[PDB]
Amino acid sequence: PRKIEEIKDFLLTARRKDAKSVKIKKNKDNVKFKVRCSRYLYTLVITDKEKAEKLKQSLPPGLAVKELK
Amino acid sequence: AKRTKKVGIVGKYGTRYGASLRKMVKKIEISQHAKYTCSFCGKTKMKRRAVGIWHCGSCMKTVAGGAWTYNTTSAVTVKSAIRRLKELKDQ
Amino acid sequence: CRKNTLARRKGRHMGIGKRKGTANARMPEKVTWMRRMRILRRLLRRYRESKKIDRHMYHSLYLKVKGNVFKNKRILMEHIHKLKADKARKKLLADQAEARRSKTKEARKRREERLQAKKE
Amino acid sequence: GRGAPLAKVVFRDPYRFKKRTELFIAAEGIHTGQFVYCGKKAQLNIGNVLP
Amino acid sequence: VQRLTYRRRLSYNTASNKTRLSRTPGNRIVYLYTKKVGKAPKSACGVCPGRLRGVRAVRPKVLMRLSKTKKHVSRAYGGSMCAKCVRDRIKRAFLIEEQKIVVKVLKAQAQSQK
RNA sequence: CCUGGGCAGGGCGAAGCCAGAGGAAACUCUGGUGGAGGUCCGUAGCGGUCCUGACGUGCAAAUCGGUCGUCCGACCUGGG
RNA sequence: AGAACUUUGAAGGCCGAAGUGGAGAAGGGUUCCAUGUGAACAGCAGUUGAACAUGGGUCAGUCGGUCCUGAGAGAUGGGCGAGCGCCGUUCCGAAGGGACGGGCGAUGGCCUCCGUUGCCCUCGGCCGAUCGAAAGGGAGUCGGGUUCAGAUCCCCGAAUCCGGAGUGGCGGAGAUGGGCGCCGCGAGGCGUCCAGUGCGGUAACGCGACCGAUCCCGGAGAAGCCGGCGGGAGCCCCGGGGAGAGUUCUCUUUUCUUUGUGAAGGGCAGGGCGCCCUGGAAUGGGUUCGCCCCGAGAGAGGGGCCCGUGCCUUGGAAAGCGUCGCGGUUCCGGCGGCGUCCGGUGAGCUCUCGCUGGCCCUUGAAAAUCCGGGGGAGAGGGUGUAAAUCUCGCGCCGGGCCGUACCCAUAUCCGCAGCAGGUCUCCAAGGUGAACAGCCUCUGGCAUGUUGGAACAAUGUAGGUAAGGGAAGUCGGCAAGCCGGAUCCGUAACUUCGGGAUAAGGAUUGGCUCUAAGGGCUGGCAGCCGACUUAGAACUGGUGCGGACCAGGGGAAUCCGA
Numbered sequence A: 001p002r003k004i005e006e007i008k009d010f011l012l013t014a015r016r017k018d019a020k021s022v023k024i025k026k027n028k029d030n031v032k033f034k035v036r037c038s039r040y041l042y043t044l045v046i047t048d049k050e051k052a053e054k055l056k057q058s059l060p061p062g063l064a065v066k067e068l069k
Numbered sequence B: 001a002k003r004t005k006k007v008g009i010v011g012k013y014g015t016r017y018g019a020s021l022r023k024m025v026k027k028i029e030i031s032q033h034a035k036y037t038c039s040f041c042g043k044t045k046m047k048r049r050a051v052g053i054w055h056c057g058s059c060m061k062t063v064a065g066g067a068w069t070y071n072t073t074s075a076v077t078v079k080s081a082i083r084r085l086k087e088l089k090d091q
Numbered sequence C: 001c002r003k004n005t006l007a008r009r010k011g012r013h014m015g016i017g018k019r020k021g022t023a024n025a026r027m028p029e030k031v032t033w034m035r036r037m038r039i040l041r042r043l044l045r046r047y048r049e050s051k052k053i054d055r056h057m058y059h060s061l062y063l064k065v066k067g068n069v070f071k072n073k074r075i076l077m078e079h080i081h082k083l084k085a086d087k088a089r090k091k092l093l094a095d096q097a098e099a100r101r102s103k104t105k106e107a108r109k110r111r112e113e114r115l116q117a118k119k120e
Numbered sequence D: 001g002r003g004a005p006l007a008k009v010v011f012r013d014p015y016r017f018k019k020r021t022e023l024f025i026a027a028e029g030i031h032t033g034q035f036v037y038c039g040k041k042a043q044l045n046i047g048n049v050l051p
Numbered sequence E: 001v002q003r004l005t006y007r008r009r010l011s012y013n014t015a016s017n018k019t020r021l022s023r024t025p026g027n028r029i030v031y032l033y034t035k036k037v038g039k040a041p042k043s044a045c046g047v048c049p050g051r052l053r054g055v056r057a058v059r060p061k062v063l064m065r066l067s068k069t070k071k072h073v074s075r076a077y078g079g080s081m082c083a084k085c086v087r088d089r090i091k092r093a094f095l096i097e098e099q100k101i102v103v104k105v106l107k108a109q110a111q112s113q114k
Numbered sequence F: 001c002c003u004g005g006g007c008a009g010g011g012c013g014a015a016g017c018c019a020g021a022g023g024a025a026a027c028u029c030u031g032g033u034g035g036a037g038g039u040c041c042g043u044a045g046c047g048g049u050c051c052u053g054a055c056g057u058g059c060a061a062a063u064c065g066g067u068c069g070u071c072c073g074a075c076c077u078g079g080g
Numbered sequence G: 001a002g003a004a005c006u007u008u009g010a011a012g013g014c015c016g017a018a019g020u021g022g023a024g025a026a027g028g029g030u031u032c033c034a035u036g037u038g039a040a041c042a043g044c045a046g047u048u049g050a051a052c053a054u055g056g057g058u059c060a061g062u063c064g065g066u067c068c069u070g071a072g073a074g075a076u077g078g079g080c081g082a083g084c085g086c087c088g089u090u091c092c093g094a095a096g097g098g099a100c101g102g103g104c105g106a107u108g109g110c111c112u113c114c115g116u117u118g119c120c121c122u123c124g125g126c127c128g129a130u131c132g133a134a135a136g137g138g139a140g141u142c143g144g145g146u147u148c149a150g151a152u153c154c155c156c157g158a159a160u161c162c163g164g165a166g167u168g169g170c171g172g173a174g175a176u177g178g179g180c181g182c183c184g185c186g187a188g189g190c191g192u193c194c195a196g197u198g199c200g201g202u203a204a205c206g207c208g209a210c211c212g213a214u215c216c217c218g219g220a221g222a223a224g225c226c227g228g229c230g231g232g233a234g235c236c237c238c239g240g241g242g243a244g245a246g247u248u249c250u251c252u253u254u255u256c257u258u259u260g261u262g263a264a265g266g267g268c269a270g271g272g273c274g275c276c277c278u279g280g281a282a283u284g285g286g287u288u289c290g291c292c293c294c295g296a297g298a299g300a301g302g303g304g305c306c307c308g309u310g311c312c313u314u315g316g317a318a319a320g321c322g323u324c325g326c327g328g329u330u331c332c333g334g335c336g337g338c339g340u341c342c343g344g345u346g347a348g349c350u351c352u353c354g355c356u357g358g359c360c361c362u363u364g365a366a367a368a369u370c371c372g373g374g375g376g377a378g379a380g381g382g383u384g385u386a387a388a389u390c391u392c393g394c395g396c397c398g399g400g401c402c403g404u405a406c407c408c409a410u411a412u413c414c415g416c417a418g419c420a421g422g423u424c425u426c427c428a429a430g431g432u433g434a435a436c437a438g439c440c441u442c443u444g445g446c447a448u449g450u451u452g453g454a455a456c457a458a459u460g461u462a463g464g465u466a467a468g469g470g471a472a473g474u475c476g477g478c479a480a481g482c483c484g485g486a487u488c489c490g491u492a493a494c495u496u497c498g499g500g501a502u503a504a505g506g507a508u509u510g511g512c513u514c515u516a517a518g519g520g521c522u523g524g525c526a527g528c529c530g531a532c533u534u535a536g537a538a539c540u541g542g543u544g545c546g547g548a549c550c551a552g553g554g555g556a557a558u559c560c561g562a
């Protein structure tokens, strides 16, 4: 399970093909993005809900999106 | 204090095994457990390994020595005789 | 057992007649020695770090604590007070004697300079 | 099982580019780092095996 | 105080069946096995004992996975010599070469005188 | 023979070391530290002394109960 | 139909963590599980069972076999033998069918150029085929859930290893620099020449990668037993908080239960270092429980490496657990809220890591595998354009065969049997206590060991007392009983001077109030915070104090054997 810090590298990794799933999990103090590409789970943790909303707005459309509770 | 008067190192055996045997084991157990002065590094850290093998803690230089002391007097005699017959007329 | 153990911490149920192992089995001699001498051999460091005792007398009291001379921290501190109060008196008296010697050697060298100026 | 200490003396092999390792009986008074000289006209000291 | 058991079908406390114990996320004390400790490669040829520094110390077949930095030191004679041997052997080789030059030119001057 | 496994606590206190006292020297005395032993009481384990105890067409074609010896070892033990 | 035995409830008990518990190796072979029967078998009975009958159940690249050698066993070569054969494991043997490059030749594909095959040259100890361990060596998986019976195998989710990839999947290194001359204000371009098989730190060494063949060197694999000591974990203990349960005759901010973060990756503690630099020390100094160390470089200061099983992060709260409710008959790993905290102490236990020491006429396994280094035959773009290569970051494909149920035993094994016998290991709580001693509880099992009821004769078998005397009994102090723990005193004869020795002999030991001593952390000698031990004093109990359990009779002598 690997952790990404930049939005840029995360987004490039998300468009890097044979990544089939993105989970989105909301929390009390942060929000996390799960990318299940292959051999790994790429977690992006971020605390700003506005940045998360604009990132999910600019998220690529063909990739699957699932919200967790 | 001085805890024993005669037996010295051999007191670990106790009242058994015999007087003269303890008397003759004393004089060579002190020799095999004594630290010796290394002739190479000049420290006093020689220690006996398994029988015949002597080892110094500095410089790791391992010397084949006597079975209970560092040098047999017969062996020192042989080394002096060997150097004498060496420089005797060059063979 | 909590009530009984609080009574133990008071110091009850612990006479002669409710011991069954030896004293060396209950609280061992080697354990007493380890605790006692780690305490006394770090108090000397807490002095030596600051200035309570100099480098030379540190080693003498280190050997004298390794030998069974001092029982505990209090009498160790009482003995360090006595050695420091002795060293201070002896260094004061020696400095006063060196001051007298400096006065006499100063006066002799100045008299030699006076006689040299009377010559030239 | 042997009372003698056993020395591990390494040699250079003059035919193949390779070091060979033999097992001599340790003569009294040798030590790790003393050179052992062996052959016909080898000089005579302790450890020097010679005809 | 939960008593806990081997997970494989071993029983004997061998050197290979060497274990530790952890705590599950599912609130249970489980008994987790342990790979044996791999001692580092020690020094080349007879010097003072002590393992070679800066080497990722593992079991042998682990070394297939490892990259070519964590097996050797950047120096010449990387994962064999303990660098005190290097700074001895360089001086030793150089000084013996110089003594051989001195002995050879001494033979030449002796034959010149003779 | 090889390869593995196993042995609670304690009493006795040698070598080595430290301090103090004495001595001219040799060295001696006193208090600690130290933890050696085919070492002492004793657990598991292994044996089987005594009660010539129980049983004695038995629980059993050699067992049980007390009382016992030894437990760092010339120890005990599985598999090959 | 039938209840002293089946099942449920309640009550009272036992096993009491070296178990009547929870799981395995060898062995057993379906006994495992459900349903049905109770004719025989279970030594009484039975609605029951391990009995009988019907029908189900054992899922693995990462658990083990397979592979390696050990003690050994065994074949060819050889020798012996009337003979099946035996000896023998390097000995009396032409015992390698492999590879590197080169050359000649052939074949085929996109005949670009790759891929085969034949021949030749060069190189290449095999201390010998093969077998031998379900505990030695041996890469790589952990968590949650799931069934009438499975579980590291099924599912969910998260990882990892080994191979393979040829027209070399995709990126990144190798990699793009510098001079000259010209033009251009300049930014840049033109042309020529040249370099470029990586970079940093004084080191110890570091980074994402860092061309390498025959060959050679080395390391790992790879070490005994016992002490000590330090760290880390788990467990136990204490103080405070939060949920639920028990008690409330009187008191009890009370008692009990519960109170979580996998492998893998990154980072930070911590510990260890025989690892470097600066620097010279004796009035000797530094440090351990003990040692030990020092001019072959101590202290001091600054750096470096390894283990990092501890903590944080990613997994991760969506799960799991506790509790409180709400819906669907069921089918839902449903639905929703709340919480899943703080701290501390330790000669404590158990495991592990590391340090150092002791002991030895004991020196305490071999090999498959894998790596590093030394060397440098070779390979490659030759310039404005990029390769030889790659152990770096990603991506694709596959991982074959077999075992996997259950008891593991006072009822599934052996003993002619449901036989106090025998049999190999792991985990092991609270109190008392020195303790895994014996005794009592808690988790977790159990019905008293192939039957029950009534009565309490003899003899028994196991146990316990006895007034006086104390061995008078008897072959014999046989048996039983006395002392027995600890503290404080005191300890002879003899002797190999180590012992004898817990010699012999005394005293004391309870409950309850204290008192004194034994420490840590903070500040420029003072303030906060704590461990369980020792000594002494008073009061007092019907002389009673190791109160049960635990537990040495002693001396005097002789013979023999250390």
Ligand SMILES: [Mg+2]
Binding pocket: C029
């Ligand atoms: Mg002592």
Ligand SMILES: [Mg+2]
Binding pocket: F039
């Ligand atoms: Mg003994």
Ligand SMILES: [Mg+2]
Binding pocket: none
């Ligand atoms: Mg005795």
Ligand SMILES: [Mg+2]
Binding pocket: none
């Ligand atoms: Mg006894």
Ligand SMILES: [Mg+2]
Binding pocket: none
């Ligand atoms: Mg016993």
Ligand SMILES: [Mg+2]
Binding pocket: none
């Ligand atoms: Mg028995």
Ligand SMILES: [Mg+2]
Binding pocket: F048
């Ligand atoms: Mg017997």
Ligand SMILES: [Mg+2]
Binding pocket: none
């Ligand atoms: Mg018997």
Ligand SMILES: [Mg+2]
Binding pocket: F052
């Ligand atoms: Mg009889």
Ligand SMILES: [Mg+2]
Binding pocket: none
């Ligand atoms: Mg009878």
Ligand SMILES: [Mg+2]
Binding pocket: F070
């Ligand atoms: Mg004994």
Ligand SMILES: [Mg+2]
Binding pocket: none
């Ligand atoms: Mg009825």
Ligand SMILES: [Mg+2]
Binding pocket: none
């Ligand atoms: Mg019954």
Ligand SMILES: [Mg+2]
Binding pocket: none
């Ligand atoms: Mg009982």
Ligand SMILES: [Mg+2]
Binding pocket: none
């Ligand atoms: Mg059991």
Ligand SMILES: [Mg+2]
Binding pocket: G043
């Ligand atoms: Mg019947």
